[PDB]
Design a protein around this ligand. Sequence first.
Ligand SMILES: CCCCCC/C=C/CCCCCC(=O)OC[C@H](O)CO
Ligand SMILES: CCCCCC/C=C/CCCCCC(=O)OC[C@H](O)CO
Ligand SMILES: CCCCCC/C=C/CCCCCC(=O)OC[C@H](O)CO
Ligand SMILES: CCCCCC/C=C/CCCCCC(=O)OC[C@H](O)CO
Ligand SMILES: CCCCCC/C=C/CCCCCC(=O)OC[C@H](O)CO
Ligand SMILES: CCCCCC/C=C/CCCCCC(=O)OC[C@H](O)CO
Ligand SMILES: CCCCCC/C=C/CCCCCC(=O)OC[C@H](O)CO
Ligand SMILES: CCCCCC/C=C/CCCCCC(=O)OC[C@H](O)CO
Ligand SMILES: CCCCCC/C=C\CCCCCC(=O)OC[C@H](O)CO
Ligand SMILES: CCCCCC/C=C\CCCCCC(=O)OC[C@H](O)CO
Ligand SMILES: CCCCCC/C=C\CCCCCC(=O)OC[C@H](O)CO
Ligand SMILES: CCCCCC/C=C\CCCCCC(=O)OC[C@H](O)CO
Ligand SMILES: CCCCCC/C=C\CCCCCC(=O)OC[C@H](O)CO
Ligand SMILES: CCCCCC/C=C\CCCCCC(=O)OC[C@H](O)CO
Lengths: 384, 384
Amino acid sequence: GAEHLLEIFYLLLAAQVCAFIFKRLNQPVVIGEVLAGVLVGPALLGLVHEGEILEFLAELGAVFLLFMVGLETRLKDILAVGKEAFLVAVLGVALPFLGGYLYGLEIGFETLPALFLGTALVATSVGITARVLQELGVLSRPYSRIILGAAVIDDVLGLIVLACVNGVAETGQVEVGAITRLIVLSVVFVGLAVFLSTLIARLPLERLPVGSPLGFALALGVGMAALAASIGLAPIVGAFLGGMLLSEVREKYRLEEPIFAIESFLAPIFFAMVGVRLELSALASPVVLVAGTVVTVIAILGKVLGGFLGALTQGVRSALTVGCGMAPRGEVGLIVAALGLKAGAVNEEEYAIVLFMVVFTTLFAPFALKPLIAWTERERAAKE
Amino acid sequence: GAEHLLEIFYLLLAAQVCAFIFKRLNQPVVIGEVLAGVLVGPALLGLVHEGEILEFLAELGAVFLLFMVGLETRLKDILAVGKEAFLVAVLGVALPFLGGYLYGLEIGFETLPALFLGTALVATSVGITARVLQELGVLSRPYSRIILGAAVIDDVLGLIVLACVNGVAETGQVEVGAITRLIVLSVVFVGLAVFLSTLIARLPLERLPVGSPLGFALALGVGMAALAASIGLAPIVGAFLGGMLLSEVREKYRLEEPIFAIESFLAPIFFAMVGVRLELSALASPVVLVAGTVVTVIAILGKVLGGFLGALTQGVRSALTVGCGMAPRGEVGLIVAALGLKAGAVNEEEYAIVLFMVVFTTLFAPFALKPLIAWTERERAAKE
Ligand SMILES: CCCCCC/C=C/CCCCCC(=O)OC[C@H](O)CO
Ligand SMILES: CCCCCC/C=C/CCCCCC(=O)OC[C@H](O)CO
Ligand SMILES: CCCCCC/C=C/CCCCCC(=O)OC[C@H](O)CO
Ligand SMILES: CCCCCC/C=C/CCCCCC(=O)OC[C@H](O)CO
Ligand SMILES: CCCCCC/C=C/CCCCCC(=O)OC[C@H](O)CO
Ligand SMILES: CCCCCC/C=C/CCCCCC(=O)OC[C@H](O)CO
Ligand SMILES: CCCCCC/C=C/CCCCCC(=O)OC[C@H](O)CO
Ligand SMILES: CCCCCC/C=C/CCCCCC(=O)OC[C@H](O)CO
Ligand SMILES: CCCCCC/C=C\CCCCCC(=O)OC[C@H](O)CO
Ligand SMILES: CCCCCC/C=C\CCCCCC(=O)OC[C@H](O)CO
Ligand SMILES: CCCCCC/C=C\CCCCCC(=O)OC[C@H](O)CO
Ligand SMILES: CCCCCC/C=C\CCCCCC(=O)OC[C@H](O)CO
Ligand SMILES: CCCCCC/C=C\CCCCCC(=O)OC[C@H](O)CO
Ligand SMILES: CCCCCC/C=C\CCCCCC(=O)OC[C@H](O)CO
């Protein structure tokens, strides 16, 4: 009760101050919110700790981030760059996987350990990227729409990979029955959202038995995140689709301001909890810094190349910007590593290498993405 | 993760539909939100269960309800009816306590069991009352301001009583050292809020190192709820004070719409969880319905009389309206009963009698308060 209310106060207070600090320094505001969590968490002040309640609030924040981002995104404008989104997603899976596997072989790993290394680099965690895009007011640009589209397909691809790795870790074989169930559920869910995108215009919510348009919008957004999560997709993918279902009507029922209000409250908790979780090891382990630095470079270059090649139609600046946006990694990578520990294919030093990579690809993305965006925008202006 | 996201969806969905239903029936919308929780909870559909995460979200909703209510309330307008707020609060403690104790003696209870019965009737839980006042747009009226003021003092009085009952249940004696620590912390907290009410005008938040006015407002609101809770006061008392600190500046930094957005999201979860918790016993126990009905009548009449006598300066209609608003009971009553079980002063049938009273005073208040308000407003109009 009171404990958890104090914790939230310390997070919001710290995140408000560090946001102000990073604004005044013209650095990415979202990195301030992460630092805030580091400061109040167990690494230093010890006022906030890992817990179930805070982590669920963190999850709601991410959901309302991408729910808000969906609101500002026409589906049709995603479809306009669908072929690029798709390419960016598949190459962003293949290339980091290949580089990770070949590097594994290079450093004496056996076959299965090498495959696990490669698969741990495959999934994008687009939350911090979407926050930056929103922060800089470029959600409507083509590199932004390619990123968001690629993130959705990358999450389907990520779940396929997760399902296969789960099966191998448990049964030792590829569980195609399980894989296909999840592909089916996924493409049906996504494809059905594209169809339900229509009913929102073709039926006004006067005749709908709800307390308010907003109340309807909130139930829909959370429900879509909920349905995504029950399939095994990330909740932020459902939230994003949920937002896009409502984008059409966002002005009419004045949805942007209240949903942005709620994001303003919870999304800082999301990024602050990233900080709270940061384990400032390994300094004791020496091989973790060498292989972990190289794996991080490979993880980043794989995504940066995927974006570059798949989005090259928009130019080198936009395409590298797309690539950087896909670089941050997250939970799916850690889970794969952990399932690898259960399968005997991964050791604790390999785990820490993946953890190291997850942390620094996450911190990397905003620092590269802010100036890359400015660089892309400068070019647009010079071409008039 | 996914489980809890599904649960929230079911609550919001049900609460949105039942809100619509109670609006179309001209019944209190907040009772719809409670019914919603009953329907989706274990009593029927079983889609939602009691849990830590949901209960903390419920708590945040109540906080943002009273935080919003504070925003619409000038401290000066509370002070204008301070003498009535104070009287209403003390009589609303004394009278239900006396009636409960004398009725206890009447039905064969011993001394200590009788005192515990009386003390269980003492505390107001103003959440559902404040929701109704807000719903009907009468937060500025004098009966509303007396209710809110009386609720704050009633929470201090409630904590005194709780602290004494805690001591008796543990040590068998009145722990005056503990009582006075808490009175000191309480009046200092409240009194200090009245002083900090000034600094908000006398210092603009340009020079403040925060990401945004809203972000500052959110940290302040939660922090005040947090500080209240750490003292042992209800978080909604801190939230209410937090809101009042910002009322002055609500228009200038446009705080009303975003804080209302957040209330719209979480407050329905609060009142829906009330429903989820409802245990539709006792039907098997026959004495619970007879003594529980009488205790509920006594609990209501005690508060209704306290409001009537302490607010009589506003007229019979406003004063009865004040009295009804103070009638709903809650957690402090159940805790007292439970501490009574530990002290040997309370039995399970007495507990169920208190539980019965908590439930029906809570459901009672909106049904009486809506027409009483209309009745008071009709009188104002007829006097012109
Ligand atoms: C229109 C807004 C969307 C509201 C969502 C409605 C609730 C449905 C969820 C039922 C339970 C999970 C659904 C599901 O697809 O299951 C797939 C797993 O593999 C097994 O649970
Ligand atoms: C054609 C219209 C232009 C593109 C769409 C418009 C986007 C609107 C959203 C404003 C968000 C800017 C501030 C922000 O990112 O806040 C992030 C969290 O709330 C935490 O503070
Ligand atoms: C239930 C156990 C904890 C789950 C949280 C997983 C993260 C742990 C490691 C430190 C932070 C790494 C960056 C990161 O995870 O960000 C990804 C976004 O938060 C998706 O939730
Ligand atoms: C949005 C990128 C377009 C910039 C065009 C080329 C160079 C000019 C200035 C860019 C500097 C980065 C923008 C920035 O600081 O973000 C605003 C904080 O989030 C709000 O405090
Ligand atoms: C201006 C907004 C208010 C922010 C609140 C700042 C944080 C302070 C809390 C420290 C721990 C509890 C404080 C306290 O009064 O203790 C009383 C108990 O009896 C013992 O914890
Ligand atoms: C002088 C100004 C008049 C008095 C103060 C104005 C009050 C403004 C708040 C509007 C609230 C009405 C709707 C409502 O109660 O919603 C409750 C939850 O959000 C759940 O839906
Ligand atoms: C931690 C254990 C559960 C705590 C919740 C206490 C309520 C239980 C009984 C059923 C509902 C009675 C009405 C009621 O409690 O409302 C009071 C407002 O919710 C204050 O939180
Ligand atoms: C606010 C009380 C002033 C009423 C004056 C005397 C009689 C006229 C009509 C009162 C009926 C109750 C008001 C009401 O239904 O509330 C509005 C829903 O909350 C919004 O759907
Ligand atoms: C009828 C709606 C029930 C609520 C949940 C949504 C619908 C289906 C739930 C899970 C049933 C199995 C999924 C499926 O269709 O694919 C089966 C694989 O391809 C066999 O390997
Ligand atoms: C490269 C192109 C990518 C396209 C991916 C296509 C995936 C499959 C489509 C799913 C269509 C619905 C199937 C269905 O309703 O149920 C399938 C039975 O029940 C499983 O046994
Ligand atoms: C099947 C058992 C019957 C009991 C209730 C369950 C069935 C459906 C939900 C009732 C919801 C009531 C509001 C409603 O849907 O009507 C709204 C108008 O279209 C607009 O006036
Ligand atoms: C200096 C600020 C520390 C942070 C928390 C706020 C201040 C005081 C914390 C608890 C100290 C005891 C409370 C008190 O002053 O009263 C003592 C009884 O009257 C003795 O029975
Ligand atoms: C009927 C009138 C009601 C007035 C209630 C007055 C309660 C007490 C005032 C508290 C003033 C601050 C005292 C303080 O700072 O510390 C007190 C030492 O440390 C305790 O040993
Ligand atoms: C004591 C150790 C020093 C390290 C930092 C801790 C001390 C204070 C907090 C720093 C907050 C930075 C922003 C700030 O407060 O300045 C805001 C201007 O008044 C407006 O320009």
